[PDB]
């Protein structure tokens, strides 16, 4: 192991699961459950067989309000969804005994597709999942009803949309969690271009499971981007543990101690007490009736402060049951804690900066939107390297229905299909088990 740090792991109920776990046991580069989480997102595709049937029946393909009169095709796709999905799986799979999975949902109106891992071992990125799935279902529909050569192009438009005239799958009736690689803000960002609503949708509005999974995705992307390399690797691992994995029950205990009456300022005061109690910080200098705090471990102070930041979101936005205030919490938790202690805030100001623009682009006219439509690959919320988006996932989970663009509006196909995978719906479970299983191999 490169680092000596050890952490105690807990479950989504505050119960201790494993004590003295090496820090690198939670690393995406080592944890086998995080590896299964990343690879599952890459290869999982939702197929809307009902949407394909309705698009063909009305010739409404290729984007919003689009229709080609005279091209209508009446095919009972949902009625034959079992045969169609079986025929597609035969083309999606590599061998009869690989990890290919095709399951029907909603009585055949939907299809969960997991492209086998063998195709990705010889692929450069992740686009094989939608492209192999789309062409397999297009061919399966054509073979099922013997669609003629002259009409088959309508099936293609109903499945994949206006591509390749549009760069995106504009009007497609398939869905994934990742977007096309061209829409990356930068190289290595693919695991960040996952809408918060997609995570909240498939976590079924569980706060800790959404917070854990968001931190897993955010910090895993930090490794692909190279940010979690060398001098910064320990800082991102500590942030993953204490902010997203509830290391040492710090997030859980802070929420419990301030849930009935607490505020953001009270969570800060308790965190500074806990950090001073655990030797993370110490009084470095005294001014006139003001103690200046210092530390010899900035990475650990950042992790503790990030833990209090997550708890402040759960206390502040949990009391309001409205996610919108998370941008204010992300801002002034960091603003107040800097003038309370004299130490830098989480991500050395990057969370406060992200929160400033996130507040603006969610309360104004120039763009953005609701807290659920943002993600790590958004220009507004890409700046903090994994310490801000996880707090939004916890906030959107607590929202009682105040968002116009909720996960039900933008992630309906995701919540029905991607929540079926147990790894993503309850990721805190599998990641804690995997860290314990590998704790003596690190």
């Amino acid at each position: 192991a490169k680092f000596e740090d050890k952490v105690d792991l807990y479950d989504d109920r505050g119960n201790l699961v494993e004590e003295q776990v090496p820090l690198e046991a939670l690393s995406p580069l080592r944890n086998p459950a995080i590896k299964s989480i990343v690879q599952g997102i890459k290869r999982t595709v939702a197929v809307n067989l009902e949407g394909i049937e309705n698009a063909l029946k009305t010739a409404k393909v290729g984007g919003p309000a689009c229709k080609i009169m005279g091209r209508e095709l009446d095919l009972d796709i949902v009625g034959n969804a079992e045969s169609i999905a079986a025929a597609a799986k035969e083309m999606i799979q590599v061998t009869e005994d690989d990890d290919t999975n095709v399951e029907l949902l909603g009585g055949g109106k939907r299809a969960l597709v997991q492209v086998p891992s063998a195709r990705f071992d010889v692929a450069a990125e992740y686009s094989a999942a939608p492209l192999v799935t789309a062409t397999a279902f297009v061919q399966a529909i054509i073979n099922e009803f013997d669609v003629s050569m002259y009409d088959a192009n309508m099936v293609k438009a109903a499945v994949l949309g206006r591509y390749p005239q549009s760069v995106e799958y504009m009007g497609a009736n398939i869905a994934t969690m990742l977007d096309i690689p061209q829409k990356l803000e930068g190289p290595g960002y693919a695991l960040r271009n996952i809408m918060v609503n997609h995570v909240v949708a498939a976590t079924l509005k569980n706060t800790l499971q959404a917070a854990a999974l968001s931190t897993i995705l955010e910090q895993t992307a930090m490794f692909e981007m190279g940010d979690a390399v060398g001098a910064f690797e320990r800082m991102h691992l500590l942030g993953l543990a204490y902010q997203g994995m509830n290391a040492d029950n710090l997030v859980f205990d802070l929420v419990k101690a301030n849930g009935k009456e607490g505020t953001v300022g009270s969570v800060i005061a308790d965190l500074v007490e806990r950090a001073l109690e655990d030797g993370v910080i110490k009084v470095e200098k005294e001014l006139t009736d003001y103690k200046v705090y210092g530390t010899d471990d900035l990475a650990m102070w950042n992790a503790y402060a990030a833990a209090g930041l997550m708890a402040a979101t759960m206390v502040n936005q949990g009391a309001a049951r409205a996610a919108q205030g998370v941008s204010s919490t992300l801002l002034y938790y960091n603003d107040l804690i800097e003038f309370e202690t004299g130490l830098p805030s989480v991500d050395f100001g990057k969370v406060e900066g992200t929160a400033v623009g996130f507040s603006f682009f969610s309360h104004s006219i120039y763009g953005g939107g609701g807290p659920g439509i943002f993600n790590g690959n958004h220009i507004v919320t890409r700046h903090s390297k994994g310490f801000a988006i996880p707090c939004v996932a916890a906030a959107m989970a607590l929202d009682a229905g105040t968002q116009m663009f909720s996960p039900e509006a933008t992630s309906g196909l995701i919540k029905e299909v991607f929540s079926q995978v147990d790894e993503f719906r309850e990721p805190l479970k599998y990641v804690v088990e995997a860290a314990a299983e590998i704790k003596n191999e690190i």
Binding site: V264, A319, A322, E338, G342, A400
Partner: protein
């Protein structure tokens, strides 16, 4: 908690606004009906419109530990109250408010701008907060204003009466009474009956209570200990981002 460093009256006034154990000095009496009238979200006696059904109508340890505010229990809309603070020795100031709001109030969504400062929360809980914001030393009827739009004035010169500029003139100074009357709600709709806002604080008390640094009051450059902490944060941020 220390809240804020410094040895000036300004620094102490910032600590007082943030400290929930500091009882804010009440300067005026405003009825419950007048607070609802000033907000302009509903008529007095009108039921709270609901954005979603009440909470009583999934399993989550966080939801079970965080007691929701009364407005979230009923499903009230999220409404706002917004204040503009003159840079000429108004008691509260934009960042002072947001910092203080998130120390004192639960479930608060605060935003800071140069010409306005807003808090959003559940409607019935907003009314409870707005009473304290309007009656206590958070507010002065001459150097502060409740403005939901057209907030221009925080940096402008005062008028002959010492009132801050208001494009919509929501607060009128009465020369005959020496008191300020609010004739419109915060969005600019005329009220049926104006709301008495009391007398403006005199300039001596303004300088005792203000939280803005100025050369003709207490300069920020003279609060050397407060500047020292800000310079320290700048250096530590720089070093942390590098290594």
């Amino acid at each position: 908690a220390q809240y804020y460093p410094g040895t000036t009256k300004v620094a102490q006034n910032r600590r007082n606004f943030c400290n929930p154990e500091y009882e804010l000095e009440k300067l005026r009496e405003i009825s419950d009906e007048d607070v609802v009238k000033i907000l302009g979200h509903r008529a007095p006696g009108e039921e709270y419109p609901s954005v979603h059904p009440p909470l009583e109508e999934p399993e989550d340890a966080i939801r079970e530990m965080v007691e929701p505010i009364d407005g979230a229990k009923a499903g009230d809309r999220v409404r706002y109250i917004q204040f503009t603070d003159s840079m000429y020795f108004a008691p509260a100031q934009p960042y002072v408010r947001s910092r203080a709001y998130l120390c004192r109030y639960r479930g608060a969504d605060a935003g800071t701008l140069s010409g306005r400062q807003i808090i959003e929360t559940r409607e019935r809980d907003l009314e409870k907060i707005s009473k304290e914001l309007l009656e206590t030393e958070f507010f002065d009827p001459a150097r502060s204003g409740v403005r939901g739009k057209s907030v221009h004035g925080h940096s402008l010169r005062l008028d002959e009466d010492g009132m801050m500029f208001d494009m919509l003139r929501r607060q009128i100074y009465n020369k005959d009474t020496g008191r300020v009357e609010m004739v419109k709600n915060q969005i600019g709709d005329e009220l049926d009956e104006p709301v008495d806002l009391g007398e403006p604080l005199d300039e001596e008390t303004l300088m005792e209570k203000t939280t803005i640094y100025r050369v003709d009051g207490e300069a920020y450059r003279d609060d050397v200990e407060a500047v020292e902490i800000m310079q320290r944060i700048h250096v530590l941020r720089s070093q942390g981002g590098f290594n």
